[PDB]
């Protein structure tokens, strides 16, 4: 990948590495949409909490936030908006999962919300022994 306007630091490569990742994500979303368009119709007649989890896999943040806000929930829409991949919330999600796994009995939450809460910790099938995405 080649950039148009040059920057000050030319020793590294931060804009090209981001552009390549964005292009790869856009290609993966376009390739997975043909198999995600059919799964969203069958999930709408069963549980409404799985729609946000199904739409978040196609690189749709605003589309998932609007669906979470227009369905009775309010905390899920505010939690899914911070999916940038930084820290802070990465440890907070793990702390919340560890608190919900014990303390107040077992805390039987929903299956769709657990995946969305564990995906914001930077590891959905690695640093999550309880809510593993395997």
Residues at the interface with other proteins (CB under 8 A)? 65, 68-69, 74-75, 77-78, 81, 88, 92, 103-105
Q: How far apart are CA 102 and CA 125, in angstroms?
A: 20
Find the radius of gyration of the CA atoms of the chain.
18
What minimum distance in Å lies between the beta carbon of 80 and other proteins?
Answer: 9
Compare residues 8 and 105 and give the one whose CB is closer to other proteins.
105
CB 131 within 8 Å of CB 115: yes
Chain centroid to Cα 99, Å, comes to 21
Least distance (Å) between residue 7 CB and other proteins? 25
Integer Cα distance of 5 and 86 in angstroms: 27
> What is the smallest separation between the CB atom of 104 and other proteins, expressed in angstroms?
5
* For other proteins, the closer CB: 40 or 92: 92
Q: Which is nearer to other proteins, 16 or 82 (CB)?
A: 82
Q: Write down the least CB distance from residue 37 to other proteins, Å.
A: 26
Instruction: Sort 119 into a burial class: Cβ within 10 Å, 0-12 / 13-18 / 19+.
Output: buried
Return the closest-CA partner of residue 48 out of 72, 29, 32: 72
- Measured from the CB atom, the residue of 77 and 114 that comes closer to other proteins is 77
């Amino acid at each position: 990948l080649k950039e148009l306007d040059s920057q000050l630091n030319e020793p590294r490569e931060y804009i090209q590495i981001l552009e390549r990742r964005r292009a790869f994500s856009r290609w993966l979303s376009c390739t997975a949409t043909p198999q995600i368009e059919e799964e969203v119709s069958l999930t709408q007649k069963n549980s409404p909490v799985e729609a946000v989890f199904s739409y978040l896999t196609g690189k749709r943040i605003s589309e998932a936030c609007s669906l979470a806000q227009q369905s009775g929930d309010h905390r899920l829409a505010l939690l899914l908006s911070q999916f940038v991949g930084s820290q802070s919330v990465r440890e907070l999600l793990t702390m919340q999962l560890v608190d919900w796994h014990q303390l107040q009995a077992d805390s039987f939450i929903q299956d769709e919300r657990l995946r969305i809460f564990a995906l914001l910790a930077g590891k959905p099938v690695w640093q999550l022994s309880e809510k593993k995405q395997i």
